[PDB]
Design a protein around this ligand. Structure first.
Ligand SMILES: CC(=O)Nc1nnc(S(N)(=O)=O)s1
Length: 283
C-alpha cells in the first residue's frame, strides 16, 4: 500500500519543491496539479513555476529536475489533468484521441517535436481529476494512451480522482470503460466522507465487478489538514486506524491519497499528518 499526494496548488501556502516531498519518505506517488487547460495546453503550479515559452506555456526546469530526482528515489510522478475550476473540455472522442498523442509527445516518451514543459523529464503517467461534470472523451483518451505507452521504456500509470458519490459525474464513464491503475476517491466535501455515510463498500463493488481492470487499486482520498477542504478532515487517529482496518482487508485497497502535500506535510498532530498515515498503513 502507498500514500499518494497531490502537489502543485499550494493549498497550505507553504508549499516546498516537489523534490523536498519526494525526499521525505512519507509519500510514494506524486500527482502534479495541474494541467488545468486543454486541448490548448495550459499548466499551473502556483509559485513553483513561472517561466514560460514565448507562447505562454509554462516551462518548469526545477520541476523537471525534481521529477527525475523523485524517480531516482523510487517514486511515481503523474501529471494530473483538470482540477476544480480551470478550463478544459473535449468536444468528442476523436478530439480526445488526438490529445493522447499530444500528451505522449509533450510529457511522455513520444518523439514528436513539440514544446516540453519538463524538458527531458518524463512523467510516469496521468491522473484524471476531472471536476466539471462533463465526461466526454476521457475513456477514449485513456484507451489511446495505453496503446502509445507500448512505445515507451517503463511502465506507465493512469488514475482517476472521482469524488465519493457513485457514480462520479465527471470520471464515471472513464472508470467504467477504460483500464485504470488507481482511483483516488475524494472522501471529502461530500456526504459519503468517513464520518458521513462512508461508501467504500460501493467502490469495492465497482472494483470487483465493473472496472475493466479487475486489479484496480482504490485509495482513501483525504484532506491533509483542517484547512485543506470544507469538510471531511479526520484528526481522530482511532477512527483512521479502524477505517484502515476495515478497508485494508481486500486486494483492491491501494492506500491513502491526500489533498495536498503542502497541507499533509505541515499539518502536525507533533508529527506530520502524512507520517501518521504512512505509519498506520505499514501496520
Ligand atoms: C483531487 C482534488 O482534491 N482536486 C482538487 N482540485 N482543486 C482543488 S481546490 N478547490 O482545493 O483548489 S482540490
Amino acid at each position: 500500500t502507498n500514500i499518494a499526494v497531490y502537489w502543485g496548488q499550494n493549498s497550505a501556502g507553504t508549499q516546498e519543491s516537489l523534490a523536498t516531498y519526494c525526499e521525505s519518505s512519507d509519500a510514494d506517488i506524486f500527482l502534479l496539479s495541474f494541467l488545468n487547460q486543454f486541448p490548448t495546453l495550459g499548466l499551473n503550479f502556483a509559485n513553483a513555476c513561472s517561466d514560460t515559452f514565448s507562447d505562454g506555456l509554462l516551462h518548469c526546469t526545477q520541476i523537471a529536475e525534481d521529477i527525475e530526482t523523485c524517480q531516482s528515489l523510487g517514486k511515481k510522478v503523474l501529471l494530473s489533468l483538470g482540477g476544480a475550476s480551470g478550463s478544459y473540455l473535449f468536444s468528442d472522442d476523436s478530439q480526445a484521441e488526438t490529445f493522447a498523442q499530444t500528451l505522449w509527445d509533450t510529457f511522455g516518451e513520444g518523439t514528436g517535436a513539440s514544446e516540453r514543459p519538463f524538458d527531458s523529464a518524463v512523467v510516469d503517467g496521468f491522473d484524471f481529476d476531472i471536476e466539471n461534470n462533463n465526461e466526454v472523451g476521457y475513456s477514449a483518451l485513456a484507451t489511446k494512451l495505453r496503446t502509445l505507452f507500448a512505445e515507451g521504456t517503463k511502465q506507465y500509470y493512469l488514475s482517476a480522482a472521482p469524488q465519493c458519490p457513485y457514480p462520479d459525474a465527471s470520471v464515471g464513464d472513464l472508470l467504467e470503460n477504460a483500464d485504470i491503475d488507481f482511483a483516488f476517491i475524494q472522501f471529502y466535501n461530500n456526504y459519503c466522507s468517513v464520518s458521513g455515510q462512508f461508501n467504500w463498500d460501493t467502490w469495492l463493488t465497482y472494483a470487483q465487478t465493473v472496472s475493466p481492470n479487475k486489479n484496480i487499486k482504490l485509495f482513501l482520498g483525504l484532506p491533509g489538514s483542517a484547512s485543506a477542504a470544507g469538510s471531511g478532515y479526520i484528526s481522530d487517529t482511532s477512527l483512521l486506524e479502524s477505517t484502515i482496518a476495515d478497508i485494508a482487508s481486500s486486494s483492491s485497497f491501494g492506500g491513502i491519497a491526500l489533498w495536498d502535500a503542502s497541507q499533509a506535510f505541515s499539518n502536525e498532530l507533533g508529527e506530520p499528518y502524512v507520517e501518521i498515515l504512512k505509519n498506520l498503513l505499514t501496520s
